[PDB]
Symmetry: D2
Subunit: 348 residues, 4 copies
């Protein structure tokens, strides 16, 4: 603890999202959790919900409806869809808000109702929200009040593709993406599908053709391309808790080589602490960024002429979620972006 | 009637699988097993899970007596295979699980393996052991080159679709995933539980030794040179393999059309099943069986389709198919000793 | 399929137990499933409940009420607890029944109600039921109509301990047992505690002093000792799907050595196909019996004078459950015990 | 970083031990690695050996013989064995040294030879070395130049047992211990037995009667009891990377209850940040201390009258190794004990 303390409120902290925010803020010198909510577990001690955090001095969980924000400086929000928009819309003006849900991610409010089953409840506010892909919208994020924190898959995919598309080094046709993620992305909910026995020692694709993150990914790619981009995105559930890898099979622009893609990503992220372009032909392993806020990537040439292969990995729970959220709040509060986010990966 | 089996190079996982599968085979009985590093040792000592099996002690390959052997399963190094197999007696059914006799173009072999083919004559008579596809040929063959795991999972769905001209041979993008058991039992830092568990990574980028084997099969089906994109990934699981093929369909063809053609092609096949509706094949669902489960889906991009195929890399992807082939070449039903259902959970 | 088919009925087949029975019987040349029941999953196709069995020609699930036993030879039962006692009590007479639940394992009626919450609903029937520990009560089981198939932990423990106690080679004082089991024993029920994320890469003890298998184990040991035996049993949930290991720390009788124990178990089980004493100082691995109906064991000298350490492993789902259930039905039907049970361990 | 820099040298850093030290020191404001040795991988960048540490600014590994200690203040040592004593003996008589090997853990030189074959090579230095069980020998560690960092199993075992024995609350007879550990404790050595395929989905006991940690454990227990303590210790290799759990089945002294044991541990470690006694009957999970320098423990009454069950868990790589080493060096350098050791558990 140092500098001036920033009073934090975590809304919807009973999931893994909340556990990670707590974990990360325990290492942050200024951010201090003062209020935590979990409607289904109000009155309970967080240490009772997450035994691994028993040594942390935290306030008892309260129902979000009883949360007092008058003496709070910033909020990390992780509530259900629809309810999020209503709650955030009512929060006081003097606050920094980072919503980890997808509720304020899509600019097209109609595109939201189509993919989430209901009318956008905060259309006015949606126009004020800024997409939290730190390294890409940094300028806009630092003077934004409401930040819509990106989803995990979208984060791993846009970091490499956005800059390449803006520079016109790759075409926007036939972008084939095969993404893999640890099962922690499915949450703590009691589901037969996510049982150790149903997951361990095996894998399988899911969300074929229409995963809810597709619109989010295309939104960012379309803005970079200045034309409607339609991708092929196939996620796969892996028998591991943490870690995410997105492999993008792209067609390069006329005369462009895999090395050209490599050099552009290199100069684009050379000064970026959390986005690292690996050396030579080193292959990024998801195991090498677990527990860190890092994104490791590299690009290789495809056996097929004119094509390239891009591999991007992150800890779906950190840079893919809570890590990026804290990174954004650091930026919004004017603090170094790496504050409390320098934990090196836990390997083995 | 009992068929005397010899297993050359049985100290690996491949050998263990052969022993396990032949344990429930009414006719095939192992009489000879070789291994040079672990020669003289009891197999139950190399693989404690097979301690109840009555097997001969391992012997050096140079001391193996094939005179009283009917069939042979071969699993030797990247070069010693051609020499050894070339010197085996004539009256024998031979199923080589290595990749030494998989490529017909003797030239392509030198390219991807360094040295020149050491048995070009035999190469001409060897038959690619992709059972469901070359059944007729395998039945008449003396020497069968058992397919590799990735190639098996891929050619089964792709060969018939290309022959029927329902998919194009351009931009065939393949992302394959395999359990680390495919890496072998060799002592390596990279394959340690600590270096593998709770994580994944791609490997053999652009230049994996199975690429020409895959293209060979696709090219003949297409009658033109096919160049694919193939990217394998090492998964943190022991058994299981899943190949995802992102293909472009011919004009006017839909994903369902591909589904129906595969359905018709394999309706009578016991070990290749097309799942119903849009059910997704899980590698966990075929572990320990000689099955290959597959299904095809519409791609979000117009004119494209997504094909998913899974097998147990150690069974239908290796030893299972080798036994399926030997049954065929020995005149026995193909499923003999290969009806074990998947071990799930 | 060989001469003389036996029509099998499986009640409560929607769980892992049922799945294992299906897998095993597909290997059985005589046993053929003709009826399968599921409570809140009736009418569905078994291949839909368990995709890995999609190739098996099986009857669709029906309500237990619709079960027609007129043409059924044997019955495998796996139900709630309390529901089992009722259903079995009301079953035909000319039926061979193997109950995998714990309902008919304990002879002490009060002891049951005391460990299962409710009172025994078939006290009269309980007296006819035979404990299904094959190798130990083979003669009784053979002529029994109702067989109470043993639990997994109890199977791994009694096999080595019962003969040793009968032989008076070990004392019944301070029998300390630390058992470890794969999470598959917890069932396919949707529960947070059994999620991959909550189980993977970690272990923990459970049921500390108060596990339902204790009275089952003590019952067998007390009978073998002709005295009331009170043990120390502590189970541990391991991050693996199947496999089970029981480590018994016992005190040997005066003048007895670990080798003496070893030789008695060897002679006791030399002609037993499914109970094997490993050679020399070989340590039994759970990974080495997975998928088989084997129980591998060995006994070692303890550093403390006068003590020994016995290690016993089995696949909790096979010899610890469905495999032994099938072993028992074979015996009851006059078929070789290994019929459909010669599957060698799936390793790796 | 802040407050005068402490230049660190790590001898034998190519293993998990060294990687862990690097990870922990990256979070330490004062400790800065300046020298790292390794013979096999001499000349290589640490980031090439451990890809998860590529963003760290470290010196290339150098052969120990070419190591320069002129600009080093303290040293962490993780050399083979039989090599440690000779090397440490030759280091500058002014460096603070924490040896993570077992070579200086045994005070009785005769015991060392009697257990390792060859004689102790630095018996004179041995008398000077201090056993590094921080919470137990804090005062001595503060003043030591050479600290023999405890092994993992012994640390998890002595923390609970030592206090209880000194208070004579438990007998020193029939102390039965069954311990479990993640395979990371086996090292990064290329070995068939530690392959994913040979470890995953299975467990097995090892070192039956004869594990090298036994004399270390008995040394601590005998000191506490003031008599020779002979224990029963049985380790087990678990299919998980990190984590360790020791379960001690002990006999309580006359009139002593489990609660008495609980209350004494509660009182003993009340002010200890890294040794936590859980509440009520809360069971410690190894998954709940992963990545942290914590030891979670609890005690329960055994089903057998007069007996009790103690469970202690830690991350074998942190509190069981590098975490405690850093903890000790903090004391020796006069820095707050928890400096750079406040990382909360990585769960899930």
């Amino acid at each position: 603890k140092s500098g001036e303390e920033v009073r934090i409120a975590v809304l919807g902290a009973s999931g893994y999202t909340g556990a990670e925010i707590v974990r990360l803020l325990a290492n942050h010198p200024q951010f201090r959790i003062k209020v935590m909510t979990a409607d289904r577990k109000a009155g309970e001690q967080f240490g009772s919900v997450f035994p691994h955090l028993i040594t942390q001095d935290l306030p008892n969980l309260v129902a979000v409806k009883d949360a007092d924000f008058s003496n709070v400086d910033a909020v990390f929000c992780c509530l259900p869809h629809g309810t999020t928009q209503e709650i955030i819309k009512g929060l006081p003006q003097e606050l920094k808000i980072v919503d980890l849900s997808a509720d304020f991610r899509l600019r097209d409010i109609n595109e939201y109702a189509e993919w989430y089953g209901h009318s956008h409840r905060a259309p006015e506010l949606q126009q004020e929200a800024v997409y939290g892909l730190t390294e890409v919208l940094r300028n806009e994020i630092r003077n934004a009040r409401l930040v819509a924190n990106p989803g995990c898959y979208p984060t791993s995919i846009q970091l490499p593709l956005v800059p390449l598309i803006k520079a016109k080094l790759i075409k926007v046709s036939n972008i084939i993406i095969d993404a893999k993620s640890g099962v922690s992305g499915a949450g703590r909910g009691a589901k037969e599908a996510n049982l150790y026995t149903e997951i361990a020692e095996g894998i399988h694709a899911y969300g074929i053709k229409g995963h809810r993150h597709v619109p989010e990914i295309e939104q960012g790619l379309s803005e970079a391309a200045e034309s409607k981009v339609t991708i092929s995105f196939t996620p796969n559930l892996i028998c591991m808790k943490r870690g995410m890898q997105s492999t993008m099979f792209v067609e390069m622009a006329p005369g462009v080589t895999a090395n050209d893609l490599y050099q552009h990503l290199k100069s684009t992220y050379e000064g970026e602490e959390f986005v690292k372009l690996l050396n030579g032909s080193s292959v990024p392993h998801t195991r090498h960024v677990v527990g860190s806020n890092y994104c490791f990537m590299n690009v290789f040439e495809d056996r097929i002429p004119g094509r390239a292969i891009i591999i991007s990995v992150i800890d779906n729970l950190v840079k893919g979620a809570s890590g990026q959220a804290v990174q954004n709040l650091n930026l919004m509060m004017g603090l170094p972006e790496n504050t409390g986010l320098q934990y090196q990966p836990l390997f083995p």
